Amino acid sequence: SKEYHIDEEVGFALPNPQENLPDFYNDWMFIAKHLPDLIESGQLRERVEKLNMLSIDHLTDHKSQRLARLVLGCITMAYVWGKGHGDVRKVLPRNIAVPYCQLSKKLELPPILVYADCVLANWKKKDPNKPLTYENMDVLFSFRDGDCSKGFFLVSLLVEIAAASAIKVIPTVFKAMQMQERDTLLKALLEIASCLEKALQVFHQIHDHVNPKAFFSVLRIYLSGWKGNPQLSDGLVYEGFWEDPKEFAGGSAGQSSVFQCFDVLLGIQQTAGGGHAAQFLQDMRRYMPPAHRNFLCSLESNPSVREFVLSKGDAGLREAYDACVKALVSLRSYHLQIVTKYILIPASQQGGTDLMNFLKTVRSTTEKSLLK
Amino acid sequence: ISKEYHIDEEVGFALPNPQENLPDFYNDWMFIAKHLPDLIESGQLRERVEKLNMLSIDHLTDHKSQRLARLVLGCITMAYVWGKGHGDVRKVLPRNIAVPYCQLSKKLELPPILVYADCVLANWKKKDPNKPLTYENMDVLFSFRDGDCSKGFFLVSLLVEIAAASAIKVIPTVFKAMQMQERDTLLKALLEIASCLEKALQVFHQIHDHVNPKAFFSVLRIYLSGWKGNPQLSDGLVYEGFWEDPKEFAGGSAGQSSVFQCFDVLLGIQQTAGGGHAAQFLQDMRRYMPPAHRNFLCSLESNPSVREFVLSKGDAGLREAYDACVKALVSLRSYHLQIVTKYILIPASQGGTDLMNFLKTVRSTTEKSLLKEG
Ligand code: HEM
Numbered sequence: 001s002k003e004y005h006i007d008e009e010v011g012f013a014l015p016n017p018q019e020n021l022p023d024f025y026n027d028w029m030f031i032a033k034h035l036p037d038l039i040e041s042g043q044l045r046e047r048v049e050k051l052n053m054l055s056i057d058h059l060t061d062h063k064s065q066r067l068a069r070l071v072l073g074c075i076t077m078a079y080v081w082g083k084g085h086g087d088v089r090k091v092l093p094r095n096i097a098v099p100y101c102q103l104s105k106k107l108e109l110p111p112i113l114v115y116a117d118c119v120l121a122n123w124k125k126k127d128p129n130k131p132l133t134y135e136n137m138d139v140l141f142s143f144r145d146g147d148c149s150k151g152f153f154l155v156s157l158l159v160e161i162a163a164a165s166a167i168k169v170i171p172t173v174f175k176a177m178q179m180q181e182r183d184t185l186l187k188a189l190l191e192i193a194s195c196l197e198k199a200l201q202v203f204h205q206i207h208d209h210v211n212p213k214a215f216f217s218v219l220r221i222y223l224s225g226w227k228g229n230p231q232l233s234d235g236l237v238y239e240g241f242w243e244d245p246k247e248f249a250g251g252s253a254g255q256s257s258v259f260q261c262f263d264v265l266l267g268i269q270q271t272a273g274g275g276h277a278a279q280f281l282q283d284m285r286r287y288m289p290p291a292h293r294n295f296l297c298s299l300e301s302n303p304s305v306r307e308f309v310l311s312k313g314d315a316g317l318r319e320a321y322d323a324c325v326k327a328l329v330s331l332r333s334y335h336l337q338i339v340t341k342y343i344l345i346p347a348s349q350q351g352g353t354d355l356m357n358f359l360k361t362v363r364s365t366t367e368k369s370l371l372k
Numbered sequence: 373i374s375k376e377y378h379i380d381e382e383v384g385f386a387l388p389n390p391q392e393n394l395p396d397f398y399n400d401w402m403f404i405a406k407h408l409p410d411l412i413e414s415g416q417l418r419e420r421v422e423k424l425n426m427l428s429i430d431h432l433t434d435h436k437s438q439r440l441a442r443l444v445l446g447c448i449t450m451a452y453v454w455g456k457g458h459g460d461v462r463k464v465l466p467r468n469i470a471v472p473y474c475q476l477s478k479k480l481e482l483p484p485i486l487v488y489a490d491c492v493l494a495n496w497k498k499k500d501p502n503k504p505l506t507y508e509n510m511d512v513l514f515s516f517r518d519g520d521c522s523k524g525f526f527l528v529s530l531l532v533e534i535a536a537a538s539a540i541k542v543i544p545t546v547f548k549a550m551q552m553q554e555r556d557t558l559l560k561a562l563l564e565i566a567s568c569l570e571k572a573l574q575v576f577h578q579i580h581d582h583v584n585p586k587a588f589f590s591v592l593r594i595y596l597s598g599w600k601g602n603p604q605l606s607d608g609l610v611y612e613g614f615w616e617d618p619k620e621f622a623g624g625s626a627g628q629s630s631v632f633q634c635f636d637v638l639l640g641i642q643q644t645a646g647g648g649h650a651a652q653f654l655q656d657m658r659r660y661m662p663p664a665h666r667n668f669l670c671s672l673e674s675n676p677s678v679r680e681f682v683l684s685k686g687d688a689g690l691r692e693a694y695d696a697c698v699k700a701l702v703s704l705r706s707y708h709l710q711i712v713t714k715y716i717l718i719p720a721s722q723g724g725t726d727l728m729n730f731l732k733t734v735r736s737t738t739e740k741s742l743l744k745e746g
């Protein structure tokens with residue numbers, strides 16, 4: 001891999017995210033760092049409105065522009081959703097709408113909190129000389145006390161990071177195909193399958209650190225966007241940047257490059273067809289950092305691993321390829337259970353059968369990719 | 373340039389020397405496609421499609437023959453769905469055509485509807501193999517109705533596409549010249565691109581000689597229409613034997629052409645950036661291009677901006693050659709709003725404000741990318 005901004009240790013995650021901004025931006029930071037109390041005290045929306053319009057030019061390197069997107073994005077959510085009880089600001093005040101929209105266009109990202117913000121750039125080690133485990137980690141920002149944002153953002157991050165180990169193998173999959181090294185290719189594919197199986201174990205932790213009522217009734221309200229959203233039917237007004245209100249989708253692991261990445265590698269045509277599922281996953285690429293968009297595109301422009309395997313009459317290679325597919329199926333199947341516990345059952349205790357149909361469509365397109 | 377992008381040096385995105393005949397095994401497909409005018413006009417087309425035996429696609433071996441069969445099955449499918457051209461529609465595609473069509477469509481990563489890469493890029497032959505790519509020496513392979521002007525519409529579209537080919541082969545020169553910091557080479561390349569883009573506009577003028585407005589608007593447009601937001605098939609079309617429910621797909625559009633999306637990307641004209649409708653349409657139409665070609669587009673998006681590099685140099689020669697590329701795009705799109713007036717607006721006078729707002733947004737986004745035209 002080259003300049004796809006892919007890290008050997010953490011993959012698509014941002015390595016060691018900047019934790020502080022230049023002092024030129026303490027006003028941003030003081031708000032973003034105290035959202036739990038400012039929302040609860042009812043002070044937050046007024047503070048945002050009293051802000052002055054700071055420039056983005058004192059954000060020079062990539063990590064600092066990413067910390068800013070995260071800071072502005074969490075503030076925009078808190079402002080738009082308030083205490084999360086349904087009272088909704090339909091106008092983003094231009095003293096924050098304008099720098100957010102500008103810095104966004106600089107990074108070729110939409111002006112709304114995005115997976116690459118609140119997961120990929122939203123973490124820190126407690127001890128730098130200890131490893132990347134949950135206990136040694138923490139998030140940079142939360143929305144409200146008890147919103148379980150640390151657990152949900154870090155478990156998503158740990159799964160993301162577990163999948164990084166499979167990523168560095170991808171080059172040697174394509175080298176083996178081109179130089180016709182059947183043994184090297186088999187090894188690489190068994191290695192990928194091993195890493196996706198480990199990502200599954202990691203997924204288990206979600207039950208320890210996230211509670212269904214807290215996620216469904218609080219965290220999910222703050223992660224929501226304004227694209228086909230009834231409480232903002234026309235989108236949000238970015239005052240002083242766009243004439244009219246604009247629609248943008250809310251955060252989604254659909255925006256994780258890492259799962260899209262392996263569908264591509266294995267020739268699982270998830271973005272194929274005109275279905276809803278294919279359309280959603282294609283659209284979510286626009287919410288990824290452009291380096292990672294570029295990376296998916298170049299995977300797609302490679303010879304098909306699945307075609308190479310199918311043409312060899314080689315049960316060894318077929319079973320290693322199938323081990324990869326199976327691991328993806330396993331993750332999506334475990335993942336459907338989590339949605340039952342964390343969205344379906346909480347929602348019945350207050351439809352979203354469209355939600356399970358999207359995931360089951362993705363799952364079975366993977367199932368159908370099994371060779372034998 | 374990478375030859376896995378399926379771009380030919382002479383003919384560009386078009387399929388070079390398309391196949392005209394399928395194996396004898398497919399004669400029943402081929403008879404219906406060669407005689408769509410005769411079979412539609414005599415109310416016999418639907419019956420012959422319904423009398424077809426389900427044939428395996430497995431004997432379609434090389435890429436050229438699968439493209440021909442997609443063209444054959446796409447033309448037949450449009451004839452079946454639309455019929456004589458006046459509202460008698462079929463909403464179910466019979467399994468014996470729907471299944472091979474969809475197997476071949478999935479094998480080639482195109483949706484199972486007739487698409488620009490079928491009816492333009494693969495729908496042509498040279499009359500005389502030893503003479504140039506000129507209208508007089510070319511024919512299409514398939515038409516829908518006598519006097520539907522499909523020869524003129526498809527071949528002008530194709531000759532514009534081939535004209536724009538001579539600029540595409542210059543594209544690697546642009547990216548290595550920015551890399552190697554070679555100002556003179558970059559300036560020659562940009563000028564060469566703009567020149568090809570201006571020659572493409574002259575080729576565009578031939579449309580008036582071979583395409584009659586009534587013919588296009590009341591006939592050809594009918595058979596090229598899709599089933600996505602079309603009230604006549606409000607739920608789409610049932611590919612009986614292949615999917616249980618009716619799937620929706622958009623009809624052919626030069627939005628599906630890689631060439632004009634191609635140069636907008638190269639020049640950092642962000643037709644696709646945003647969340648507006650024009651951007652969404654141009655993004656979606658990428659799904660109706662051959663896969664090698666959507667690969668080519670998004671890999672251009674991966675390179676560093678030419679606009680930015682030219683802006684960072686204080687070099688009026690470079691800015692002018694860059695601007696000569698953008699202006700050639702504005703002239704194509706402006707001349708193109710001219711003929712959409714002649715072939716859609718004034719025939720629909722004897723609701724359609726959507727296409728005119730789409731083309732002006734795309735034209736406007738190009739005009740605003742200029743570095744200088746006060
Ligand atoms: C309480 C925990 C979780 C909930 C409620 C949840 C919910 C959902 C839902 C409803 C979807 C459907 C698409 C959408 O509507 O956005 C989805 C998609 C997805 N989720 Fe989750 N999720 C959870 C945990 C996770 C975690 C921790 C990951 C780790 C990366 C993950 C990975 C994915 C992926 C990759 C997709 C895209 C569909 C696919 O590629 O299979 N999920 N999620």
Ligand code: HEM
Pocket residue numbers: 528529530532533579583588625626627629632633705708711712715716727730731734
């Ligand atoms: C009678 C002739 C023509 C008619 C009636 C016509 C009509 C239209 C219409 C209505 C649109 C709007 C998008 C849509 O609704 O599909 C469009 C877009 C477009 N057309 Fe045409 N067109 C004609 C000839 C051509 C030809 C010959 C070319 C090039 C070979 C061309 C290139 C394009 C392109 C590239 C777009 C997408 C927007 C852009 O990039 O400019 N058109 N056309």
Ligand SMILES: Clc1cccc(-c2cnn[nH]2)c1CCc1ccccc1
Pocket residue numbers: 114115118119152153156220223224250251252253254
């Ligand atoms: Cl914002 C964020 C961060 C990390 C992971 C995920 C996720 C996990 N499964 N799908 N998406 C998201 C989107 C969170 C979300 C999902 C469903 C309803 C409301 C919100």
Ligand SMILES: Clc1cccc(-c2cnn[nH]2)c1CCc1ccccc1
Pocket residue numbers: 487488491492525526529593596597623624625626627
């Ligand atoms: Cl099918 C085909 C082939 C070559 C060029 C074009 C075209 C040219 N301008 N826009 N699209 C098309 C689509 C033709 C079409 C245009 C408007 C309504 C219905 C159909």
